[PDB]
Amino acid sequence: HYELPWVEKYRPVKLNEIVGNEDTVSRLEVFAREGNVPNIIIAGPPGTGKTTSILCLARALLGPALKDAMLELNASNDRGIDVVRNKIKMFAQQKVTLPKGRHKIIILDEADSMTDGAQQALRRTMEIYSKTTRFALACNASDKIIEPIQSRCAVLRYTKLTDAQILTRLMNVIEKERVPYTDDGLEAIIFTAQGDMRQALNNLQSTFSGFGFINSENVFKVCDEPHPLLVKEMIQHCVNANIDEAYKILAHLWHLGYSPEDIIGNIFRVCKTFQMAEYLKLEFIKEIGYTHMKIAEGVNSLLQMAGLLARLCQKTMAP
């Protein structure tokens, strides 16, 4: 009777339903099929399917013994120095009977939140006990993991999902959930989720639960981003070097309450796929990045935004 969220209702249960990162998922498929998995560290942006991949790999490796031979430690658990000293080492020393080629799996999700002392301790208990237990860790920023674990693991790289893949799985969810839609809503959802399947599914469920129809207007009424047509008209006026209309639209955006950060983010995201010349795109990107670092450093007012607008306008009128 409970509405399971479409993130958890339509999570993949096999490794052949994962879209994106075809080579790494194919290697995970062959390692789930044959066995003898190495200690893996999967790194990538949020939402690309790392936890789902390691869960499906653990399930396909273990089977009925998944309740006994798998120990899962997320960021919501303790994962302290004494936890690594006692619980993980005791699970590694535990005797579990498994078929040939199958080892126990200690999943450690979000190794970024693992403190450096716990990693320093986890080195040797990862090293010696590899005859019976195996380690599958996952992170976003692999630099937060100390170098000894990266030495003790195999580093698998996850990339941002290409828009075709997120479109295909969005269509799969829609055809399995009879969602009424138009192609404008598809483009709006793909825009609001930059290679993030979790954000796309959550936004789609939110607009279908809110308004019941999938078009651009409803999606930007629920996601509530600065509208990409307004930002496209900004960039188009600045291509023509019309500072008056561009500042008119940006004053409209500013008076709607959008922060400097997501305004310059949306300007960059629209400007990346804008239809103009390569050199003008390069200079536009350079000035956008300069202004974005100015917003990052702490100065974030309307004056900086309009100054970037003036620089983008003057890059056209000056050779």
């Binding site: 403190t115 450096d116 002392g117 100390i146 390069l282 350079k286 300069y290 974005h292």
Partner: protein, 49 residues
């Protein structure tokens, strides 16, 4: 070549880098230190990055 290397200098100088360079030592090729061993305490970072 000069134009490209000018944009590359622009990218290093007036664009933010992902990981904050010279965070624990100074810039490369220096003999002050650079043997920055990783952390050794279980207390969390609590940083405001």
């Amino acid at each position: 070549l000069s134009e490209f290397m000018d944009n590359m200098s622009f990218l290093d100088a007036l664009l933010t880098d992902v990981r904050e360079q010279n965070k624990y030592g100074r810039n490369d090729f220096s003999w002050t230190n650079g043997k920055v061993t990783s952390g050794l305490c279980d207390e969390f970072s609590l940083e405001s990055n």
